[PDB]
Design a protein around this nucleic acid. Structure first.
Ligand SMILES: [K+]
Ligand SMILES: [K+]
Ligand SMILES: [K+]
Ligand SMILES: [K+]
Ligand SMILES: [K+]
Ligand SMILES: [K+]
Ligand SMILES: [K+]
Ligand SMILES: [K+]
Ligand SMILES: [K+]
Ligand SMILES: [K+]
Ligand SMILES: [K+]
Ligand SMILES: [K+]
Ligand SMILES: [K+]
Ligand SMILES: [K+]
Ligand SMILES: [K+]
Ligand SMILES: [K+]
Ligand SMILES: [K+]
Ligand SMILES: [K+]
Ligand SMILES: [K+]
Ligand SMILES: [K+]
Ligand SMILES: [K+]
Ligand SMILES: [K+]
Ligand SMILES: [K+]
Ligand SMILES: [K+]
Ligand SMILES: [K+]
Ligand SMILES: [K+]
Ligand SMILES: [K+]
Ligand SMILES: [K+]
Ligand SMILES: [K+]
Ligand SMILES: [K+]
Ligand SMILES: [K+]
Ligand SMILES: [K+]
Ligand SMILES: [K+]
Ligand SMILES: [K+]
Ligand SMILES: [K+]
Ligand SMILES: [K+]
Ligand SMILES: [K+]
Ligand SMILES: [K+]
Ligand SMILES: [K+]
Ligand SMILES: [K+]
Ligand SMILES: [K+]
Ligand SMILES: [Mg+2]
Ligand SMILES: [Mg+2]
Ligand SMILES: [Mg+2]
Ligand SMILES: [Mg+2]
Ligand SMILES: [Mg+2]
Ligand SMILES: [Mg+2]
Ligand SMILES: [Mg+2]
Ligand SMILES: [Mg+2]
Ligand SMILES: [Mg+2]
Ligand SMILES: [Mg+2]
Ligand SMILES: [Mg+2]
Ligand SMILES: [Mg+2]
Ligand SMILES: [Mg+2]
Ligand SMILES: [Mg+2]
Ligand SMILES: [Mg+2]
Ligand SMILES: [Mg+2]
Ligand SMILES: [Mg+2]
Ligand SMILES: [Mg+2]
Ligand SMILES: [Mg+2]
Ligand SMILES: [Mg+2]
Ligand SMILES: [Mg+2]
Ligand SMILES: [Mg+2]
Ligand SMILES: [Mg+2]
Ligand SMILES: [Mg+2]
Ligand SMILES: [Mg+2]
Ligand SMILES: [Mg+2]
Ligand SMILES: [Mg+2]
Ligand SMILES: [Mg+2]
Ligand SMILES: [Mg+2]
Ligand SMILES: [Mg+2]
Ligand SMILES: [Mg+2]
Ligand SMILES: [Mg+2]
Ligand SMILES: [Mg+2]
Ligand SMILES: [Mg+2]
Ligand SMILES: [Mg+2]
Ligand SMILES: [Mg+2]
Ligand SMILES: [Mg+2]
Ligand SMILES: [Mg+2]
Ligand SMILES: [Mg+2]
Ligand SMILES: [Mg+2]
Ligand SMILES: [Mg+2]
Ligand SMILES: [Mg+2]
Ligand SMILES: [Mg+2]
Ligand SMILES: [Mg+2]
Ligand SMILES: [Mg+2]
Ligand SMILES: [Mg+2]
Ligand SMILES: [Mg+2]
Ligand SMILES: [Mg+2]
Ligand SMILES: [Mg+2]
Length: 56
RNA sequence: CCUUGUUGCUGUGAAGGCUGGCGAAAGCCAGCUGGAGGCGGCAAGCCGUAUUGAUCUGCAAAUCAUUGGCGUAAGCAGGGUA
RNA sequence: UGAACUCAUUGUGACAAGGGGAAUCUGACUGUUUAGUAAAAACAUAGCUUCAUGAAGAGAGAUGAAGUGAGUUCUGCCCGGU
RNA sequence: CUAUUUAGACGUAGACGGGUACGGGGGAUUAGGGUUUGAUUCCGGAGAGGGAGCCUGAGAGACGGCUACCAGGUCCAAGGACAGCAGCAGGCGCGAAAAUUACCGAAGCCUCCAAGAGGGCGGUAGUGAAGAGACGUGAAAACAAGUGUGUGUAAAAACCACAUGAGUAACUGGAGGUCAAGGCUGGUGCCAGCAUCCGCGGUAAUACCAGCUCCAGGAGUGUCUAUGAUGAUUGCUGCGAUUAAAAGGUCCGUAGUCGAAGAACAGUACUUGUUUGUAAUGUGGCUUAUCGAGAGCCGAAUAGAACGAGAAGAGUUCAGAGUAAGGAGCGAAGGAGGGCUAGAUUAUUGAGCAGCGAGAGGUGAAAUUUGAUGACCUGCUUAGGAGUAACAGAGGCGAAAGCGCUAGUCAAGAACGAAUCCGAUGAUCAAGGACGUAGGCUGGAGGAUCGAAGACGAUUAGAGACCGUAGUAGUUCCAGCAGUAAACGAUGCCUACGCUGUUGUGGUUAUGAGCACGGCAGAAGAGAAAUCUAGUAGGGCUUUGGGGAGAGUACGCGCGCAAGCGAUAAAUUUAAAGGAAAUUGACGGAAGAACACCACAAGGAGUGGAGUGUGCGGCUUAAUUUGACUCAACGCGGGACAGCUUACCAUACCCGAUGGCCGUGUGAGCGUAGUACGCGAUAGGUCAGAGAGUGGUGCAUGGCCGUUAACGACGAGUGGGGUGACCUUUGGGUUAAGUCCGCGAAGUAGUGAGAUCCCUAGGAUACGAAAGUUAUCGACAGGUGUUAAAAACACAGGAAGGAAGGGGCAAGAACAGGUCAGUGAUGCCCUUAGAUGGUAUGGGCUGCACGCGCACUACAGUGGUCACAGCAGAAACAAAUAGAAGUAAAUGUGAUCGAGAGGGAAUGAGCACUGUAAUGUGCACAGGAACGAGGAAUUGCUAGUAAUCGUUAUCUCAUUAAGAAGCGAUGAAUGUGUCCCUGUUCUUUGUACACACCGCCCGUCGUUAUCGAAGAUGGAACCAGGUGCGAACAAGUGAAAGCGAGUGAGUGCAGGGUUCUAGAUCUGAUACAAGUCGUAACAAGGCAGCUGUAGGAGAACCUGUAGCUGGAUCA
């Protein structure tokens, strides 16, 4: 029974190209760690609930 | 059917037997002894495959040469008898 | 059974004396046959199966008649015609 | 090595052959016990393209020495010459795979005749994210990498010191679960892709492709491939074998592994001391480079060996010792244990004869078939070959397979009783040996009954099968071969420790009990449960399993006359497996109760046939708008359409929340007999954004309906049982109903049923003066008779008698059941001034070859026609001269008509009514079609019911009922039952079904792919041997010429041993979305299934014979 290869690549053609927006140089090493440690202060409490990423 | 004549040389090595080893048994493996067979190679013989050889006014109204088949046997043969 | 020495072509010196292998058709084997154009795959053979009979100077492990052809493995269906 | 003598040497504790390998010190992982690796700094071995010979030397069978062959090369003047990178750089190939044709009088060492010469050995840098350390990528005031001097070295560079500039510096994999971190926004719609595994995507994708935010590790992070761990899935420590994979059919037996008490003895294992035995690595430490790997120094150490010591266990011996260890023997007794000899009561067939005179046989029902040549049945005679009924059992015997009449005879064994004898003789078992139901095979005897194969008769779409008739090999015996069974209690053999009650068999007994061999019922433990040959446990020895498939198959080998049997692989494929036990449902051509005119029995009226009314399909058309399809679509959508309804078709006309921007009284736009007049913000254009739609999707919904079902079920709290999913427990009587009565590991309250409510039947003491109305009352199986309870019936009184009759309301759970065309109920998609929005005039919804559903008039005389009466539910009715809506009709009496004067279909010219419009309705005259009681089928109905007969001040409605929803008149037949059919509930039981029987599933045939066997004839390599021939070198002998043992490379010719590969054709397996023919298995799966063996057959499979329950029976 018939088979064909006519459709290879389709979705990569049809998805509209969007440009990457600019951003700062991010931290690295201990610098990144001081930044994370201040954000997560709630979580280091044994009560209440932190949430890393929410879209509401 | 009755009475008789006619087996020389060699190869292979069945049944039965004795020793030695192995095995708990049953019975297996060596070496030797023994000498069976419409069994192998030949002799005397009996036969008749090939050369489509010789001969075809013959040696001969069926022979001759070389080459072949069997040859310890449902083998070959004289006389008497049906 | 060994070893050495020896020869100018080498030694079963003349005579006597197997060519061998791979396959197929066919008949099991040794044996027999068209005397005088056919030796064969034809005939025979051991084994297998069928048939008829209580009659004998013979008595069913007997006496005669047919067919197939050693061994191994198989041998299906039909009694309408004769 | 050679001469003569002796036959040895080595093997199941694995010889010999073949395959494979540099060996250790050490490395990786690791709680412990282990599993894997070692070309690779140290030690020892071998080699220098492949083989072989050799001179020199203290030392080589040397190759940066020589000589010859074989395979390859280089230069030439063609005559000859030279050469070997598994040294250091370097090049080409091969591969998925690995650096510079660099500097060196310095460090560590080696070589010479040396106050010096040589060394790619060694050292120094360059190159590369194989591995291992320490740190950058900012701080809150103030941060690498640069540069210059000095150092450093053999010379350098880097490193370090001081001094100058300054302000540079993160990526890889992910975000549904395992597994840390987004239902975010846009594309795509089972596509494209993602995903180790599970799984995503069919237009609402937290999983694809991208954007944006998060997470993890970080100068690093992902992937592929080997291995160690995970893993008690290789089990010494430490798994399993009743049913999941797994105890050999039973004995004997060698090698092997394992073996009393008592008294003594000896030291080789065993354990331990002292001394040896380890550079590096590793282990326990300390000291110096800024720190940390690194470097330097210290201490102890494995296996192996030398010499002493201790004697528990192991070992050796002894007999004034004699196992609930074995063998020999004695006494009395028991048993379908075995071989042989001689007898037996019946039965089934066959023949003979006698009696009788028509059928026998066989089945669910029948046919083949046999009988007047006398069957069948009843007598008497006989001839054979099998078998031992009832007694006969959770009884006995045997190693298992197996063994059942009575006597006599011949060997051996088990158990019991007891002061007999010998003394370790024993347990288990590869190899080897003996037995083994049935069916089968080789030869003989025989042949009653039964019966594979083969042949018929039936049944079926077809039966080749099941059933019946018949019939052969076999089924019996003797002498052998064979070697399998669901050969099963699916539970190896010895030996232990272990609770109670009861019942057997054989001996013995102080009569209390024991010993051997059993059955049964609990308990406690155990186990995933079911259950227990399964409890406790490092006792000994053998067999044996490691996810499904392929496969107990291929090749080789051993046995067999054959049939075959024993023993046993790879390639390939796949996420689970009709794997195990239990639980809840669904189903059964399973069992037992119930129930019901949408079930039947007993009956009564029809429908299906004709003509017409109406709906549905099909076809036609400009359009014939559309939903709905077993009950539960089809006079249904309140669907009786002239307009409207109306969604469809033809033509024509009409319109637009708000906000921004722009443009406007010097006039946006509008009317017109459209160009110059009238009216003026109202209604302009463009972007956003509303709203509207009988447009789409009920598989995006709400609400409401229908159906299960009008059925008996339905959940909560507390207690009980089970590891759990889950069950609340024994199913006996009753009702319409888990409605109730009994009884219980359960008990208490509720929903559903009943009660209540509404109508119909009886009832003033109230109200009225009109004569009726309404009514808190009346019936409860209450009374009698039926001897548990709950109940039921038969009588009797009573207006009314067993839910008084009829309605209405009416659990939980469900269904992708219906409706978006009821809705200012509604999500999302679509259209929106040339509209899918309104309006108007017309046309269609009503078209007609034809198949269906439901109704209405009929087929006459139990009728038709004329007239006359006369009666409902109660109360409504201008007028009308042929006739043109209305207050019953069947019916009662008299006439008439007389067997198509029954019947009114298609149609003619008229006469009126409703209406905006006839196409709709009424009336009169003509006309007079089929139909003479309906094939296969099919629908309701138990009493004021069915059927008959009219009527609606009920609904539709201007006009239209042959439709519904009511209402009254006349009024039966038969039963008062049953579970046979059709279904529905409950309880038991089986299951390979859960998507739930419309389920699931087996095998041929045909088509594709992929991997493997065989096969006439063949190719390659690569090893060792056997024969030829023989280059180089050569001891010896010779003045010499020569001659030449021996060591041998190469090469002839035959063979073998290994590994690959070709091959016409045949034959397996696996995957085939769904092709063809049947339906073999799972329910008593429609003939209960399965194991062995033998025939047969399109194919699953069918048939004979013996066996098993894993069976549909613990009886
Ligand atoms: K001889
Ligand atoms: K001639
Ligand atoms: K002459
Ligand atoms: K010769
Ligand atoms: K000669
Ligand atoms: K012959
Ligand atoms: K002969
Ligand atoms: K001849
Ligand atoms: K014949
Ligand atoms: K013959
Ligand atoms: K034959
Ligand atoms: K015939
Ligand atoms: K005949
Ligand atoms: K020259
Ligand atoms: K070299
Ligand atoms: K090199
Ligand atoms: K590399
Ligand atoms: K350095
Ligand atoms: K990223
Ligand atoms: K993403
Ligand atoms: K999305
Ligand atoms: K395994
Ligand atoms: K073990
Ligand atoms: K066996
Ligand atoms: K004893
Ligand atoms: K006996
Ligand atoms: K037998
Ligand atoms: K048959
Ligand atoms: K037939
Ligand atoms: K039959
Ligand atoms: K029969
Ligand atoms: K036997
Ligand atoms: K045997
Ligand atoms: K077996
Ligand atoms: K027993
Ligand atoms: K078990
Ligand atoms: K085989
Ligand atoms: K009818
Ligand atoms: K209807
Ligand atoms: K609904
Ligand atoms: K069957
Ligand atoms: Mg002689
Ligand atoms: Mg002879
Ligand atoms: Mg002669
Ligand atoms: Mg002759
Ligand atoms: Mg001739
Ligand atoms: Mg042939
Ligand atoms: Mg001859
Ligand atoms: Mg002749
Ligand atoms: Mg001749
Ligand atoms: Mg012949
Ligand atoms: Mg023959
Ligand atoms: Mg035979
Ligand atoms: Mg010698
Ligand atoms: Mg090494
Ligand atoms: Mg060397
Ligand atoms: Mg050499
Ligand atoms: Mg060298
Ligand atoms: Mg070097
Ligand atoms: Mg998470
Ligand atoms: Mg993901
Ligand atoms: Mg296991
Ligand atoms: Mg099983
Ligand atoms: Mg099993
Ligand atoms: Mg077994
Ligand atoms: Mg340090
Ligand atoms: Mg001891
Ligand atoms: Mg008779
Ligand atoms: Mg008896
Ligand atoms: Mg005894
Ligand atoms: Mg037999
Ligand atoms: Mg055993
Ligand atoms: Mg397996
Ligand atoms: Mg086998
Ligand atoms: Mg009936
Ligand atoms: Mg009809
Ligand atoms: Mg129903
Ligand atoms: Mg209209
Ligand atoms: Mg409309
Ligand atoms: Mg609407
Ligand atoms: Mg629905
Ligand atoms: Mg009810
Ligand atoms: Mg109770
Ligand atoms: Mg009620
Ligand atoms: Mg639906
Ligand atoms: Mg219509
Ligand atoms: Mg009439
Ligand atoms: Mg209607
Ligand atoms: Mg079936
Ligand atoms: Mg069946």
């Amino acid at each position: 029974k018939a088979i064909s290869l006519n459709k290879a690549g389709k979705v990569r053609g049809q998805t509209p190209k969007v440009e990457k927006s600019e951003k700062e140089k991010a931290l690295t090493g201990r610098a990144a760690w001081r930044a994370k440690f201040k954000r997560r202060q709630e979580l280091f409490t044994g009560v209440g609930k932190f949430k890393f990423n929410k879209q509401g």
